[PDB]
Amino acid sequence: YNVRMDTMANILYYPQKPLGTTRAMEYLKFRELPAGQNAIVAIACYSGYNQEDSMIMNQSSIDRGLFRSLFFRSYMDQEKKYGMSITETFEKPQRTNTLRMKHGTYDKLDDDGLIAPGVRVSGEDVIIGKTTPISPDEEELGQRTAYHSKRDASTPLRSTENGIVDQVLVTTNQDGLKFVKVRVRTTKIPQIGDKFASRHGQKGTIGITYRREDMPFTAEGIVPDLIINPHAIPSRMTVAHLIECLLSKVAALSGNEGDASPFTDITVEGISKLLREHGYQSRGFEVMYNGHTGKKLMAQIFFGPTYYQRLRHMVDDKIHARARGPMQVLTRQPVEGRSRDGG
Amino acid sequence: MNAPDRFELFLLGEGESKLKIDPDTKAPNAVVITFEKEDHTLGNLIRAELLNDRKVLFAAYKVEHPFFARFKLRIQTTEGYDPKDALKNACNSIINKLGALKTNFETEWNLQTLAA
Amino acid sequence: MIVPVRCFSCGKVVGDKWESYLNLLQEDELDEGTALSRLGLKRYCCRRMILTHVDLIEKFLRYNPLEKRD
Amino acid sequence: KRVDFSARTVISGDPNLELDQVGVPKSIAKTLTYPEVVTPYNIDRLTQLVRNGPNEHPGAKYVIRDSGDRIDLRYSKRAGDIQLQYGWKVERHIMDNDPVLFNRQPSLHKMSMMAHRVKVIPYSTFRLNLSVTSPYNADFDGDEMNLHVPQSEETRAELSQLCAVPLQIVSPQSNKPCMGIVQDTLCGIRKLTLRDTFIELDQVLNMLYWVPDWDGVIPTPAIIKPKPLWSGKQILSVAIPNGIHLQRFDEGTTLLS
Amino acid sequence: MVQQLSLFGSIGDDGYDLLISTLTTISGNPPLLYNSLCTVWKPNPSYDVENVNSRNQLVEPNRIKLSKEVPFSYLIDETMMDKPLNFRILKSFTNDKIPLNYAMTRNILWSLQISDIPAAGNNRSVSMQTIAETIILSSAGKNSSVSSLMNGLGYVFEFQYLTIGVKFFMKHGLILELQKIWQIEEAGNSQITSGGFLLKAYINVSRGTDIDRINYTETALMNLKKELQGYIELSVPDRQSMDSRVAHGNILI
Amino acid sequence: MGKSAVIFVERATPATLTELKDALSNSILSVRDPWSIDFRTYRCSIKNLPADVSKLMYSITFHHHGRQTVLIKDNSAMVTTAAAADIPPALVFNGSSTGVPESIDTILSSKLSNIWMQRQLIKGDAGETLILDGLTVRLVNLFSSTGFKGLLIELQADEAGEFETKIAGIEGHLAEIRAKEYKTSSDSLGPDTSNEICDLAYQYVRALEL
Amino acid sequence: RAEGPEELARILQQLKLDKIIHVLTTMFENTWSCSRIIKIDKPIRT
Amino acid sequence: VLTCPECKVYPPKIVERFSEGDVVCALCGLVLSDK
Amino acid sequence: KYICAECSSKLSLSRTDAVRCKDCGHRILLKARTKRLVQFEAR
Amino acid sequence: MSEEGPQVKIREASKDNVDFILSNVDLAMANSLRRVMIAEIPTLAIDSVEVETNTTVLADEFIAHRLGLIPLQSMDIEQLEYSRDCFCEDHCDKCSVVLTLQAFGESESTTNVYSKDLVIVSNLMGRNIGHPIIQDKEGNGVLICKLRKGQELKLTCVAKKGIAKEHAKWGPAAAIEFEYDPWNKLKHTDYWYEQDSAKEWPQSKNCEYEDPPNEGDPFDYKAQADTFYMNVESVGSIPVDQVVVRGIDTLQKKVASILLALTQMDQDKVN
């Protein structure tokens, strides 16, 4: 993925191969390019911030790098050749002989008109400088002055995208015209409003994040990386979620890959027997204390590792507001599009 | 992004008072005391110590929303006795207990090092 | 992708032990559970960190950021 | 048709919010506005708001004169210079306890478009009480809802006296409540009121403090000796108002159940 | 910080003595002599203030005024001790020459003052201006001097001038001033207000938010102006003339 | 001519002020009204500066000495007032002043904000002042943004004959309370020109520096 | 500005008491260093 | 031609706010043309 | 400055020169990172 | 010996782990002590990086985040100052530490970039601080990155002082075990069983330190929680006994701040 200048790309920092793998995966190569992480999950009620598919997450886990993803974007441009004269040039525009300049900061551009790798671009900055010569007989209905011999054709960044320019490429196309491609990098961190899913149709959003002190803990000082609600189990009858939890816990405690292929001889009682060899309550329950006051909890809690995947929907890509702004040419009504700040 | 800065958990803003005391209008000899930039660590300790005074009737605390670091404490004591005095006695007792605990731990650790 | 320096759950450090952990697997021909316990990994969350790690840094390293095809 | 002064974002659950109150992110509150009229009762706060500027919440973003001219506060250095008069308008940010209209698509019935009171919060999600998710047919696995801001006094009064969440509890399709205790609060209010459940002193004190309508009186326990204890029914009775009477006889229940 | 509400005008010296009689007939108070010396300081051009937020214009550079009172013993020459110290001496102050020269003022080197351009709009009947003021009481150190202080802040001297005139105190805090202004340079002293007196009537308001007081002040100023109809025409000066920012240079005199 | 000295203790405890108040209780003659003090530092935001030109400017605000601010830079002092009762009558009369000035801190932090910007702020409130035999001692706890900073002691006397003996006595009194790391100062800004409040502000600056 | 007859009687009693106290304190000072700082929690038994 | 009726400065200094659909004088902050 | 895409040869190109490598003759050229590291604040 | 106060019995100790019993104490006090031991003890960690050359296969903020978690010696952290209080511009000599990292892959075989290669170039003024924490046998410590032939990395690091309430990197304690009442004499937990609850639930190691209850004894309805069993492990920066002592000191200072503010407010009320 390092070279390719795709329109969009997402990469995960640390991927983990699942603790419970089907035998067929050895042909899809899912243990070479995983798509999630093993998260400790405690199924419980705790403070009422995980109801109706929400979840609660440990903030220290976030801070140490769990579910952190790189993001990569790219843009392209090329010089156009109208007629026989080159009507577009790659050069840093100057306000002396240019009209209709954009409010973005042209300062970061080099003399070539192309920004250089390693510069923190931001909202509405420009990364490619493009100037269009205009024939003298063409006047913008009195807008043009005597010295405005050229027009601006630069490409500003999308209004929200921020980050660091990562690569710049110069080539030529079939017609011999110049060709520039810019690739930009960014980092994405989970936050209230993201989207996560398990392998059994159980997906939700983060509803609040807690620090390790307010997290309920076991007698051994272990803390759940996340907490889900038990009101999601009955009507969905996802017993495979519970079985996967139990088997993954046994494999983590033991240290060997646990088969979970369909139509085989593994049973629940067998893995419960293998669990009790290690020293835990056979049905996966455990004793946990309250994080605030330190007391004991009346009811025990189902506890163990699972596999989760970070889906493609972030709240930063869905948030939009508008007081006023551009209209439409024909109907004169607010435009369509979030990237074009419409209604 | 709308994520507030983390240092707002332990640095008071300018014009902020660490304590705010307000008389309670329902029960006689009752005060509501707001603490800023603090969480259960202090409120639980202070309430558990205030429950040991035979002249203290009521002592309860709460943290209304887990976004903001602040909490409320409520005290009610017997006639002829000031809730602020009760708070002062509780803090003194806590400090003495912690000092004794530190001395004991240091003695035990040094004894272990001698036995190490 | 190089091994995480710290454990996401209990705050412990596992980053330095990866090199020595790989040694026990083929030089001493031990099993995974005993090798994991030989390095003081006792909570199963640390065992989770070390056990399920996909080391992708040895593939990018045979490669350059210039000229991938499709 | 498309409109102005509106936002769209995912939702989440907040058990600490009141029934008819919505958590609005900070930036969305910094973008939308409201045209407040300068009067003798507000000129001090409005002056401080203008001095604050557009990069700070609370603040302001535009000032409209009597003649219709509008001054952008950002370019005009006159955040500390403009003197306000009677009849001018300050386009201020949206402040706590401002009515808004809130809905989810598709809007099949009357109860899918309701009014709310704002509370400005960090982070990027909307906040709702966990009992209004039934009229909206909405959960928190990725649903986005829409927010519309009124821009006048008559419109604000209409949103506050007609479409408010409190007034939409007895639905007229089937003349029965459309909201109630749901999910885990319902699972808990049942484990609390069994005959088995007894409560000690400290927890009773904290629980009685949590009820914001308490009157400072401690209920006399039910087991005075040899140890004071409280029954869950007793503590839960504090929430229920006074003067409420209810009788329900199930199968095979006598006057001593 | 005050909101100063002002009206301006000018008169020829020929009517000067008759004007002074009429004022005495209205106010009931006599004139009181006064003088002052103002020095204008501007930000140092050697220092590049990149902190001016060019993309937002949060602030623009401005000029600082330092004022001080100077005793009349520096303004009276050897021909004038015989006359008593009162308003009549102004009748002899018609020449561009003055006893106070450049060297004495250089030897001198208070009230520190900053202002802004008056409020915009054409529905204003009096010049409303905002003033921020402070006072310097004393100093010490190895370089205790006004010049060293203003160079420490980051300002340098631009010019200076001397005002001499009379004051009338009327009711409601209204102050009326008759002035003569002498610009001073090493090249010499030149009277800008040549052959005339500059008239300025003004009131101060302590709080800009109070609007009942501002309305009362405007009522008093317009009543005063309507009293002097036919004798002297009091007018609102040009809004672009009372602008004292460094970027653009002009000086109402 | 009165003399003054300032001693700052960095490693003090919250209760050290009470310890020093009680350890001196035998000689305490009376007690007076509480006092307060403010201490700001302003920084130069311009980069084209000479090497020999300092970058900081210390502003000390005295609340008990009639609400007066003192600006200090490179051993140069400046004293500004903001009360209408401290105005010399000539400036009011001639028209050089509108009569209701502002504190210089507002001027620095409102109009000149593109040359000077605030960097820190150290405050002291609810101090105690005690009259001993021919002496006045003021104590206060210093609070920064983070929290408690240290203890501040300022001594003022009218007769300068035995000032050093009193300073030594107070140092010994701190010595029995085992406060061994204390920085004291009684320097004078100008050997020939003696201004009391300027010298006090300079002593505060010399004591509070890190 | 006194409000109650008991308040008035207490005021007169305090008047006599502190008048005597002032007289004797002046007698001591005209010859003695009193202390105006010391406050004892419990009055000394007679 | 578009000029500020209060600054009266030639040539006029003007900035267009595209995201708000406004044309704003860069000196007095006055809004010239909307939408 | 620029850099080749196969051999990563160090080249300098003007505003009129052909966009090619001198040694390998390829038509793909990459830039060079800003030699002077520039400090920034994320806002 | 202080017989009126909390009692302590250390059973086990090492460079990393302390294992002990805390008796004659409330439950609130022990809980607050553990909360402070995890969250509110200062330490020294890298807080800013600036990079000169990066010819690796990883990103820049990737390596920055990796560097921000490496542990460094912070024994004398009481003599540094919060960078928001020091009068210096940017970073002080009294309110920061500075290190440099340089590496180049000259050899054909890939070369690992560990944390033993961080070199300190600032002035320490005779304080024991800034040294990297090394706990493995070979001494290499935290491995940071990987290099090939013809790849170089050059960067500079600024490390500062803070707490764990703002980032997980400043925390000195890994995980602390907190147990009490292994026989459930007080009836604080209610067990979940299929046939026999007394057999399905295993027994804690701590049962040997109390005597089992007898079936003939009625439920004791007057006891309170008094004995706690704790175990504390350190990341490595601070010695563990210092972790406990500094937690106690921090709790004391917080209560003393409350006391001082209350006394100030009472003096204000006097006015």
Side-chain angles (χ1 to χ4, degrees), chain E residues 1-2 32-34 47-48 51 67 69 110-111 116 133-141 143 149 153 155 167, chain F residues 45-46 48 75-81 87 90-91 93-98 100-102 111-112 114 116 195:
Chain E
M1 192 274 318
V2 294
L32 282 72
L33 215 61
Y34 78 91
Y47 301 135
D48 185 14
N51 298 114
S67 59
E69 183 139 9
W110 291 103
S111 174
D116 271 306
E133 176 198 321
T134 187
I135 298 187
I136 311 172
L137 285 195
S138 64
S139 57
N143 48 34
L149 265 48
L153 295 199
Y155 281 57
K167 261 195 175 174
Chain F
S45 62
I46 301 164
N48 290 319
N75 302 65
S76 303
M78 199 190 144
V79 167
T80 77
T81 198
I87 299 169
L91 302 197
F93 170 73
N94 67 2
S96 292
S97 161
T98 47
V100 293
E102 294 193 325
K111 303 265 192 167
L112 311 190
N114 61 6
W116 305 96
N195 208 342

Side-chain angles (χ1 to χ4, degrees), chain J residues 56-253:
Chain J
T56 55
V57 297
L58 307 154
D60 277 348
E61 61 272 30
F62 192 87
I63 294 177
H65 171 85
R66 297 188 58 72
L67 268 160
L69 307 155
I70 301 179
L72 315 159
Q73 170 77 252
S74 167
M75 191 169 97
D76 277 336
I77 205 70
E78 306 297 336
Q79 287 154 24
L80 278 172
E81 196 159 5
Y82 283 177
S83 198
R84 65 179 65 88
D85 284 341
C86 178
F87 293 135
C88 80
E89 182 65 26
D90 192 2
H91 63 292
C92 307
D93 195 16
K94 54 162 51 83
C95 79
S96 82
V97 181
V98 164
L99 305 88
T100 55
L101 189 67
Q102 313 263 316
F104 177 72
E106 83 280 18
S107 64
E108 306 163 346
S109 57
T110 174
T111 63
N112 279 283
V113 175
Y114 312 91
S115 179
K116 78 182 175 194
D117 297 341
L118 290 155
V119 176
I120 302 167
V121 303
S122 61
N123 186 23
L124 283 182
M125 293 177 71
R127 295 174 284 197
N128 182 16
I129 198 165
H131 282 328
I133 295 316
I134 314 297
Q135 296 148 311
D136 63 344
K137 189 264 293 180
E138 282 292 345
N140 288 313
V142 176
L143 155 68
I144 304 178
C145 173
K146 197 79 170 294
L147 294 174
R148 203 213 170 195
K149 172 163 201 168
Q151 301 189 297
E152 192 148 13
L153 176 56
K154 301 194 217 167
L155 61 83
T156 77
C157 307
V158 166
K160 281 172 197 177
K161 184 184 158 202
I163 74 187
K165 204 156 149 185
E166 63 161 277
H167 206 268
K169 58 174 149 169
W170 277 292
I176 58 171
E177 325 191 2
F178 173 104
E179 202 201 320
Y180 80 99
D181 194 3
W183 291 106
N184 198 33
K185 266 161 181 162
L186 282 73
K187 288 188 188 314
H188 269 163
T189 190
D190 191 357
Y191 282 144
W192 183 99
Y193 58 102
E194 273 179 351
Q195 293 84 18
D196 173 41
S197 69
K199 183 201 179 305
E200 285 149 1
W201 293 98
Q203 287 186 356
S204 57
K205 302 289 96 175
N206 278 314
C207 308
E208 301 175 345
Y209 306 125
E210 297 189 14
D211 288 356
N214 308 311
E215 69 275 16
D217 201 3
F219 161 67
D220 189 3
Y221 63 92
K222 270 321 187 201
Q224 306 272 317
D226 59 41
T227 310
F228 309 95
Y229 305 85
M230 311 215 179
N231 182 317
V232 175
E233 176 170 10
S234 79
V235 187
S237 54
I238 304 172
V240 58
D241 52 344
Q242 307 318 119
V243 187
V244 187
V245 169
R246 287 180 188 207
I248 312 189
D249 273 26
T250 319
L251 204 48
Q252 266 187 3
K253 291 184 284 190

Side-chain angles (χ1 to χ4, degrees), chain E residues 125-189:
Chain E
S125 287
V126 301
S127 172
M128 191 165 331
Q129 192 167 3
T130 287
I131 299 151
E133 176 198 321
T134 187
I135 298 187
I136 311 172
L137 285 195
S138 64
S139 57
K142 54 180 178 182
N143 48 34
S144 47
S145 61
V146 166
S147 177
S148 308
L149 265 48
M150 306 309 269
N151 304 328
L153 295 199
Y155 281 57
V156 310
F157 182 81
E158 187 165 347
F159 64 90
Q160 68 196 15
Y161 60 91
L162 174 139
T163 304
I164 290 174
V166 301
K167 261 195 175 174
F168 289 75
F169 294 120
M170 271 145 278
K171 270 195 179 177
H172 320 310
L174 165 51
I175 296 176
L176 198 153
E177 282 183 348
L178 291 96
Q179 327 188 11
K180 282 206 153 205
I181 309 187
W182 278 271
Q183 182 152 301
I184 300 183
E185 287 96 0
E186 172 54 50
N189 315 333

Side-chain angles (χ1 to χ4, degrees), chain D residues 71-87:
Chain D
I71 295 90
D72 184 342
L73 288 193
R74 177 199 184 283
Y75 272 119
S76 158
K77 305 151 291 300
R78 308 189 66 181
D81 297 334
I82 294 169
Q83 321 296 310
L84 313 172
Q85 324 182 2
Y86 290 168

Side-chain angles (χ1 to χ4, degrees), chain F residues 183-199:
Chain F
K183 185 46 78 157
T184 184
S185 285
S186 58
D187 296 333
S188 186
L189 183 45
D192 312 322
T193 52
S194 79
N195 208 342
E196 51 275 2
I197 190 166
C198 314
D199 278 305

Side-chain angles (χ1 to χ4, degrees), chain D residues 192-208:
Chain D
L192 182 80
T193 46
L194 314 158
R195 263 191 202 128
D196 208 317
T197 299
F198 283 109
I199 314 169
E200 296 156 354
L201 175 64
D202 46 346
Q203 269 180 32
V204 165
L205 296 185
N206 272 347
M207 280 180 225
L208 284 166

